[PDB]
């Protein structure tokens, strides 16, 4: 049993973190006070759930989590919410004034003055670990802390734990819930700085999540609470294999091995099904064939893009619920005769498959119905580069007039850091294109 540390950075990272840890407690039968009746070894264990949870003599299960925001408001919610006894004061780290949507201010100005305290608090958690695998880092691309501070942290994590794996979950910006017009800048900046330091990164476009909630959960105008509950189901599917007994993606190295042949192209596409409103009066349970098929519908993806026009390098299916292999294989045979699924010449056309028999837990009084079976698919396809092309274009539009640049230059950052980050992204869009098209 090897431990994982979870780092949640910024409003997005922290609020998504709450949703995740809540879902985890429900999943493992841990109560808000931190007690788990079903856990037989008091004061320790090397169980699977212990990759995420340490134990005290008093029988309390505590997240290996650290929340850092540069202002107090959000983290003060955690400090005083329903889950307040779960977390050690020293795990919750606040600054006084935030990065004002400005990557430079989060990386250089406030970053410079808080990095050490953050690193030391993580070091505290790493010391409680027999064999630390590495880090899961949660943050937006768009806020100043989530972009600027995160990228700085990653640089520093690579110094202090160079051997360790780092997996990111990154919120990609969407106008229908964005709070700043400079998100494209922040997003390119953080991506250029973090690219080398991240072993595998799961992007979640807020727009995909917002539309899934409107269409499938029949929600008028989703709030963060809606989005975060949905995002937490997807994150939970992805990390279930770290937390429960199984033989697929059981360590963080294995995510890289299964999903990332080419280390720069490390952004797998997540697709999830089914998403079913709790209000739905009556609902026919969907078969394995149906939910597997829905994995190839752009409308169920965390990033809208069209995998039919690209190539796959890798593809995992993660089932939760009543599912057997004979059903999965038959589903796959059909789907493959029906759909356009091209892998790159140097990979086997195939699928790693993991089935956990517990179906998904839902937050009681949530918008999500209990279902008999669900699937999260993780594919590494070059189609996801569409997302970078969209962000790059918005960046080019603004940068050509130097709009808002003075806010960055004013924090110390140099104007050349812009064009350098941009060129990195240009070479990354070239990599995807080279890997995924011939003609």
């Amino acid at each position: 049993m090897r431990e994982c540390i979870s780092i949640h950075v910024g409003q997005a990272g922290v609020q998504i973190g709450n949703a995740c840890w809540e879902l985890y407690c429900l999943e493992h039968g841990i109560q808000p006070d931190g007690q788990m009746p079903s856990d037989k070894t008091i004061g320790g264990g090397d169980d699977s759930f212990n990759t995420f949870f340490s134990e005290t003599g008093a029988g309390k299960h505590v997240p290996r989590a650290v929340f850092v925001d540069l202002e107090p408001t959000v983290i003060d919610e955690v400090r005083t919410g329903t889950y307040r006894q779960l977390f050690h004061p020293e795990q919750l780290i606040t600054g006084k004034e935030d990065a004002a949507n400005n990557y430079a201010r989060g990386h250089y100005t406030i970053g410079k003055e808080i990095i050490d305290l953050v690193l030391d608090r993580i070091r505290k958690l790493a010391d409680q670990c027999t064999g630390l695998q590495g880090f899961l880092v949660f943050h937006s691309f768009g806020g100043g802390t989530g972009s600027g501070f995160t990228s700085l942290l990653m640089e520093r994590l690579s110094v202090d734990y160079g051997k360790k794996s780092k997996l990111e979950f990154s919120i990609y910006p969407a106008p229908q819930v964005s709070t700043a017009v400079v998100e494209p800048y922040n997003s390119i900046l953080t991506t250029h700085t973090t690219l080398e330091h991240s072993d595998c990164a799961f992007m979640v476009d807020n727009e995909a999540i917002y539309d899934i909630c409107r269409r499938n959960l029949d929600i008028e105008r989703p709030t963060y609470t809606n989005l975060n509950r949905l995002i937490s189901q997807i994150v939970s599917s992805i990390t279930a294999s770290l937390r429960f007994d199984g033989a697929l993606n059981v360590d963080l190295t294995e995510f890289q091995t299964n999903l990332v042949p080419y280390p720069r192209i490390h952004f797998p596409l997540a697709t999830y099904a089914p998403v079913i409103s709790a209000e739905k009066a009556y609902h026919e349970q969907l078969s394995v064939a149906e939910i597997t098929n829905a994995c190839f519908e752009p409308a169920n993806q965390m990033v809208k893009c069209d995998p039919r026009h690209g190539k796959y390098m890798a593809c995992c299916l993660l089932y939760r619920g009543d599912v057997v292999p004979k059903d999965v294989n038959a589903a796959i045979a059909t789907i493959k005769t029906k759909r356009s699924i091209q892998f790159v010449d140097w990979c086997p056309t195939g699928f790693k498959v993991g089935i956990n028999y517990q179906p998904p837990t839902v937050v009681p009084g949530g918008d999500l119905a209990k279902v008999q079976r669900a699937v999260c698919m993780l594919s590494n396809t070059t189609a996801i580069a569409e997302a970078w092309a969209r962000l790059d274009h918005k960046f080019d539009l603004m940068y050509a007039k130097r709009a808002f640049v003075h806010w960055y230059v004013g924090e110390g950052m140099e104007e050349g850091e812009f064009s350098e980050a941009r060129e990195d992204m240009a070479a990354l869009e070239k990599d995807y294109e080279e890997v995924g098209v011939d003609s």
Binding site: L152, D245, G246, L248, I332, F343, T349, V353, G412
Partner: protein, 55 residues
Amino acid sequence: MEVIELNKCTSGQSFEVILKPPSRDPSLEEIQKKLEAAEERRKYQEAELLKHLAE
């Protein structure tokens, strides 16, 4: 067409199916330098401001 690596437990199972076969990070020292060059640039902008204002 071909199942491999079948692994089962009480929690569930996992395996792989094949349909077709296939045809130097910054040092602590550098990070400190660029943080500080940045703060040198902030501090210089601000001291210019304070100059103009004194004028």
